[PDB]
Design a protein around this ligand. Structure first.
Ligand SMILES: CCCC(=O)OC(CO)CO
Length: 265
């Protein structure tokens, strides 16, 4: 129901809670509805949490044009401008983490602190998973694509013991599908990231976090990020993968809240 007009397009967002602003940036082809709800609701107790649909996703406009990480970052800053927020804590997951890096480099004045979740600096120094594995875009229903996607983010035992919790998220994901053309624009956007050499210039206090057994974005990329960014802290969660925000939710909340309690806008 709420929209901000940014760079000539409409971006759907939701904002909740009181406290310092915390902007959450979601990954490849994923709308705000993809956020773990307990994670987001818990953060609203201490922070004013902003979530949103990147262009191409959810209820935002979906222009069929080349997308880039710079463009996504410009959209995020424009959202903050529309909300009249001069400075925000930024947490980005996966491609959202790439957007966050771009924000910290090119718009440092807008970024109070930086949290980089299961992400990568891209380029020849990064380690990707096979492009093949990013086929959670098949011949499958959207529902069965989501269930197959869980195998990339969660262990078999986690999927078994948390079945009801995972399945309850399906309707929220199916409510606004990312169309194939937009998904491809997001995928190509991931190859426009040119930040490795500039990571050392990031001034924001930084936390880098991932699951050790991430099969989609190898966890070594977090070690690379943490090494390059001055003063960056590193949190690797042991029995967890790409879906660590869900499968390591309480340990990550504890680390994230402790990090944020030492920060300000
Ligand atoms: C500072 C803006 C407060 C605001 O209007 O949003 C509220 C109500 O949704 C939650 O933060």
């Amino acid at each position: 129901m709420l929209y901000a007009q940014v760079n000539g397009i409409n971006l759907h967002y939701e904002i909740e809670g009181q406290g310092q602003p915390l902007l959450l940036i979601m990954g490849l082809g994923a709308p705000a509805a993809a956020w773990d709800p307990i994670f987001v609701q818990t953060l609203t107790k201490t922070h004013q949490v902003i979530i949103y649909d990147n262009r191409g996703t959810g209820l935002s406009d979906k222009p069929d044009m080349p997308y880039s990480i710079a463009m996504f970052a410009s959209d995020a800053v424009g959202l903050l401008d529309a909300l009249n927020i001069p400075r925000a804590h930024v947490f980005g997951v996966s491609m959202g983490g790439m957007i966050a890096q771009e924000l910290a480099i090119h718009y440092p004045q807008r970024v109070a602190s930086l949290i980089l979740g299961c992400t990568t600096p891209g380029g020849k120094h990064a380690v990707p998973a096979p492009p093949e594995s990013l086929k959670a875009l098949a011949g499958l229903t959207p529902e069965e694509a989501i269930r197959e996607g869980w195998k990339l983010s969660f262990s078999e035992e986690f999927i078994h013991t948390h079945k009801a919790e995972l399945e309850a998220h399906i309707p929220r994901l199916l409510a606004q599908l990312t169309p194939r053309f937009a998904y491809e624009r997001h995928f190509q956007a991931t190859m426009t990231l040119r930040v490795f050499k500039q990571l050392k210039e990031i001034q924001a206090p930084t936390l880098v976090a991932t699951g050790r057994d991430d099969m989609l974005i190898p966890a070594v990329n977090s070690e690379i990020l943490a090494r390059e960014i001055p003063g960056a802290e590193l949190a690797i969660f042991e029995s967890a993968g790409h879906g660590f925000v869900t499968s390591a939710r309480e340990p990550f909340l504890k680390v994230l809240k402790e990090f944020l309690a030492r920060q300000s806008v």
